[PDB]
Amino acid sequence: TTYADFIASGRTGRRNAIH
Amino acid sequence: SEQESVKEFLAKAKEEFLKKWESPSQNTAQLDHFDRIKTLGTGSFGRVMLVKHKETGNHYAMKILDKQKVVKLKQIEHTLNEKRILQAVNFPFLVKLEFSFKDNSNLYMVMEYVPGGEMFSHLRRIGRFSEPHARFYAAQIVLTFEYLHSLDLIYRDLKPENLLIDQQGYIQVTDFGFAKRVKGRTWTLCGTPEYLAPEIILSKGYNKAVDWWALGVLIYEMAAGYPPFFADQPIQIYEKIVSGKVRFPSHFSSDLKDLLRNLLQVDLTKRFGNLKNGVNDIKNHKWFATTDWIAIYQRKVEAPFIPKFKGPGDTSNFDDYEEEEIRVSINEKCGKEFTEF
Numbered sequence: 001t002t003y004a005d006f007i008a009s010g011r012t013g014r015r016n017a018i019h
Numbered sequence: 020s021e022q023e024s025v026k027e028f029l030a031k032a033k034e035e036f037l038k039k040w041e042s043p044s045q046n047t048a049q050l051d052h053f054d055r056i057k058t059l060g061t062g063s064f065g066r067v068m069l070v071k072h073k074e075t076g077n078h079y080a081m082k083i084l085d086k087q088k089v090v091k092l093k094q095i096e097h098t099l100n101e102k103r104i105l106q107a108v109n110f111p112f113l114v115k116l117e118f119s120f121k122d123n124s125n126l127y128m129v130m131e132y133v134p135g136g137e138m139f140s141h142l143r144r145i146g147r148f149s150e151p152h153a154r155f156y157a158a159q160i161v162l163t164f165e166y167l168h169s170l171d172l173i174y175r176d177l178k179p180e181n182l183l184i185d186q187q188g189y190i191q192v193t194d195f196g197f198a199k200r201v202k203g204r205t206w207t208l209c210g211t212p213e214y215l216a217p218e219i220i221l222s223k224g225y226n227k228a229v230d231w232w233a234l235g236v237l238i239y240e241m242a243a244g245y246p247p248f249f250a251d252q253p254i255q256i257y258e259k260i261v262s263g264k265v266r267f268p269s270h271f272s273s274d275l276k277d278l279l280r281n282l283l284q285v286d287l288t289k290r291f292g293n294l295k296n297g298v299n300d301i302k303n304h305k306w307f308a309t310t311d312w313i314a315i316y317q318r319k320v321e322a323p324f325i326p327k328f329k330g331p332g333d334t335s336n337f338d339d340y341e342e343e344e345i346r347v348s349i350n351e352k353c354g355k356e357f358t359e360f
């Protein structure tokens with residue numbers, strides 16, 4: 001499921017701004 | 020008539036904003052006015068700490084920026100933007116700047132303490148919000164962006180990490196680190212990867228329409244539990260964003276998908292919020308048909324939940340962070356660069 005893919009991804013924590 | 024009232028409200032709001040924009044407050048407290056309690060969040064420039072103001076006993080969130088780090092990161096003008104704008108704005112869903120000052124080492128912005136934690140924390144824990152709950156939060160962002168944009172301000176860092184829940188269950192936007200007052204287009208590469216509009220990624224001039232794109236990303240993430248474009252490498256996120264494709268969970272209502280196709284529109288000439296009707300293409304969309312915009316502004320709508328509160332100065336709705344001792348150098352750093360702060 002897309003949710004399972006999200007939860008296993010490296011991007012579920014707080015996301016830093018870019019610049 | 021409703022639209023004329025909004026017009027008149029924003030006109031008076033701009034008169035008040037510009038008075039403070041042109042004559043910013045400066046140096047309205049000092050560090051030893053506060054007892055430092057606990058770190059509430061971290062960032063590249065510094066940290067936000069829970070503090071107690073000694074003379075009143077009020078709790079505040081004090082954002083601390085290391086001037087030398089701000090310079091190294093080429094964020095001088097953005098940091099001046101952030102404080103000049105925050106001290107001038109006034110809206111129910113914008114965190115209130117109460118004091119600001121600087122010393123030899125750091126910049127300090129002292130805000131009203133919002134005790135209910137980041138929306139990010141509640142969203143990750145519960146998984147996803149129902150559409151009524153997501154609509155309740157989204158409506159507040161719609162009104163906040165209508166306010167900011169009317170003042171020629173672009174926010175540029177919308178995400179759940181920056182939306183705090185207050186004791187009434189309503190949203191307070193914090194972190195104006197990328198907020199900018201601009202009438203033309205602008206060009207700075209800034210934001211958070213999942214929320215970047217295509218025109219930012221592609222190095223085009225852009226305007227307030229990037230905030231409405233980001234609203235589409237936020238509403239999607241609130242209602243789905245994951246953002247519309249994600250991957251472990253930022254480059255792959257950008258490839259998804261510019262591709263023009265987006266898929267929706269099967270539980271997304273028909274109205275929600277139609278709203279999101281118009282917000283997550285790669286074509287600036289078709290993106291809701293950037294058309295002839297401005298924000299009213301959003302406010303009048305069927306997905307918002309039950310939203311009482313005035314009642315939301317007046318905080319008269321029952322919230323989806325009220326965060327838990329053990330007492331004043333309680334931080335249980337926030338993660339724990341490693342504490343670092345705030346040091347102030349004997350020598351003034353970067354004085355010229357931050358003279359107006």
Ligand SMILES: Nc1nccc2cccnc12
Nearest residue numbers: 060067080130132133193
């Ligand atoms: N105004 C605030 N209140 C509580 C927590 C906060 C965390 C980061 C930034 N601002 C905050």
